[PDB]
Design a protein around this ligand. Structure first.
Ligand SMILES: *O[C@H]1[C@@H](O)[C@H](n2cnc3c(N)ncnc32)O[C@@H]1COP(=O)(O)OP(=O)(O)OP(=O)(O)OC[C@H]1O[C@@H](n2c[n+](C)c3c(=O)[nH]c(N)nc32)[C@H](O)[C@@H]1O
Ligand SMILES: C[S@@+](CC[C@H](N)C(=O)[O-])C[C@H]1O[C@@H](n2cnc3c(N)ncnc32)[C@H](O)[C@@H]1O
Ligand SMILES: [Zn+2]
Ligand SMILES: [Zn+2]
Lengths: 114, 299
């Protein structure tokens, strides 16, 4: 019945003014990409930074199991695009937000399916 | 002039010399390049490395296999692996490794001394950024070092496909004479200094298109002396210019042919194709790796 809740703990830590996880791995790119959220190669547009996925994944970075019965990571081995305004905390961003399964952009940060 | 390149390759004339080994004294030693905002040194360094590899004749087959030693960092992540995976065609199998634990975008990661690592399959490209901290404890003559360099020479001879390539990081004191000797078993070779780290004696020893036999006999003690002589007499201006043009960064998927071939079958026509970046010789079986684990009961 007991399973540690790391997402909740990071969100609470952040809201207390704790400093966001650093050393997220930012990539050099053209910044002329599709802007989709999670891609096989860096795809930042002019409003985004692209990062190596593992380094932006809370579970990867904290050495804890992934929330997924198979243990699969959505980010490792891919690149995550993060709005440049939020790139001070790529881990917080990927945790709090969600990817539209239709167009592949971040809901509210690219997704226009409304 | 060099400053708009990703870095500088050892000019041929320095390779042909017969210098004695001196101390390296770089006039910009320690200086720091100005990196684009928020970019780590190792992302810039590996980006310039890959931008330079783009100008060589690397074999790039379907189902390419790449292994990356020394991929960890004191940060617990793997910036060079992230650049390699960006550079390499999507789907390239990428394995990395390091003594200390780290999180990686590689398809598989092995934690341990590199001498514990074994692979059933051969590889088309080997990258190493291994560097031993103790090499900093400079207690004497600068002699050829063994350690992980001995592993790397064996690993190349045993598990690098014909036609495959290597980039192995060295410095003034982190080097090995047989590794230079082994550069003569490639169709071409150089020592490449990135422009972002031009103030360091670091270079990448690059062997391009492996032939499995000596094209050239190289005295590795002399060749490192030659490399230091070059660095000593050719100050390189720090530069991050090339980082601002990523339009042509991805390695082109050439679809290089892979054939298996017994030693009896490597004729001069084959050697010619190997040396041009047009052929890889290895089996195309499944990639299987392991790390040896020393078992002990301390109770
Ligand atoms: O990027 C560095 C990293 O990948 C790796 N490295 C260095 N140190 C470590 C540790 N402790 N752990 C893991 N990895 C490490 O090496 C890459 C380059 O490092 P750098 O310090 O730039 O190497 P350096 O040019 O100093 O060559 P090195 O073989 O280490 O020399 C050791 C020692 O020798 C003196 N020295 C070298 N050089 C070229 C000098 C020079 O030009 N001028 C003067 N006055 N001294 C020089 C130094 O005392 C070095 O400490
Ligand atoms: C400067 S770091 C690598 C930085 C990394 N390439 C990156 O992309 O940021 C040097 C690495 O070489 C590794 N290393 C050194 N000697 C090794 C050995 N004998 N076996 C395995 N790894 C070794 C160290 O653990 C160390 O992490
Ligand atoms: Zn993860
Ligand atoms: Zn959408």
């Amino acid at each position: 019945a007991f399973a540690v809740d790391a997402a909740k703990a990071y969100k609470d830590y952040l809201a207390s003014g704790g400093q966001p996880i650093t050393n997220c791995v930012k990539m050099l790119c053209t910044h002329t990409g599709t802007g989709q959220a999670i891609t096989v190669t860096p795809e930042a547009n002019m409003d985004q930074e692209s990062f190596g996925g593992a380094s932006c994944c809370l579970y990867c970075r904290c050495h804890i199991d992934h929330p997924n019965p198979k243990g699969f990571c959505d980010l490792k081995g891919k690149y995550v695009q993060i709005p440049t305004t939020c790139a001070n905390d790529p881990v917080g961003f990927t945790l709090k937000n969600t990817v539209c399964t239709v167009c592949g952009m971040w809901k509210g940060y690219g997704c226009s399916c409304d | 002039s060099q400053a708009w390149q990703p870095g500088v390759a050892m000019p041929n004339l320095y390779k042909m010399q017969r210098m004695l080994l001196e101390k390296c004294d770089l006039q910009n030693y320690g200086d720091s390049a100005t990196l684009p905002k928020g970019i780590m040194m190792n992302v810039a360094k590996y980006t310039q490395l890959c931008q330079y590899l783009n100008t060589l004749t690397l074999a790039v087959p379907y189902n390419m296999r790449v292994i990356h030693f020394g991929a960890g960092s004191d940060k617990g992540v793997a910036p060079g692996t992230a650049v390699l995976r960006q550079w390499l065609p999507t789907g390239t199998l990428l394995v990395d490794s390091d003594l200390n634990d780290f999180v990686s975008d590689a398809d598989s990661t092995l934690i341990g001394d590199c001498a514990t690592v074994h692979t059933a399959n051969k590889w088309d490209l080997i990258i190493s950024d291994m560097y031993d901290p103790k090499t900093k404890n400079v207690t004497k003559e600068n002699d050829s070092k063994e350690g992980f360099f001995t592993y790397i020479c064996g690993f190349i001879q045993q598990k690098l496909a014909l036609g495959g390539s290597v980039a192995i990081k060295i410095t003034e004191h982190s080097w090995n004479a047989d590794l230079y000797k082994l550069m003569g078993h490639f169709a071409w070779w150089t020592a490449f200094v990135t422009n972002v780290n031009a103030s360091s004696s670091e270079a990448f020893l690059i062997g391009c298109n492996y032939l499995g036999k000596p094209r050239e006999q190289i005295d590795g003690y002399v060749m490192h002396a030659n490399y230091i002589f070059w660095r000593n007499t050719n100050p390189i201006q720090l530069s991050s210019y090339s980082l601002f043009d990523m339009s042509k960064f991805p390695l082109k998927l050439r679809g290089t042919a892979v054939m298996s071939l017994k030693e009896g079958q490597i004729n001069d026509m084959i050697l010619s194709l190997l040396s041009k970046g047009r052929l890889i010789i290895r089996e195309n079986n499944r990639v299987v790796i392991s790390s040896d684990v020393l078992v002990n009961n301390e109770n």
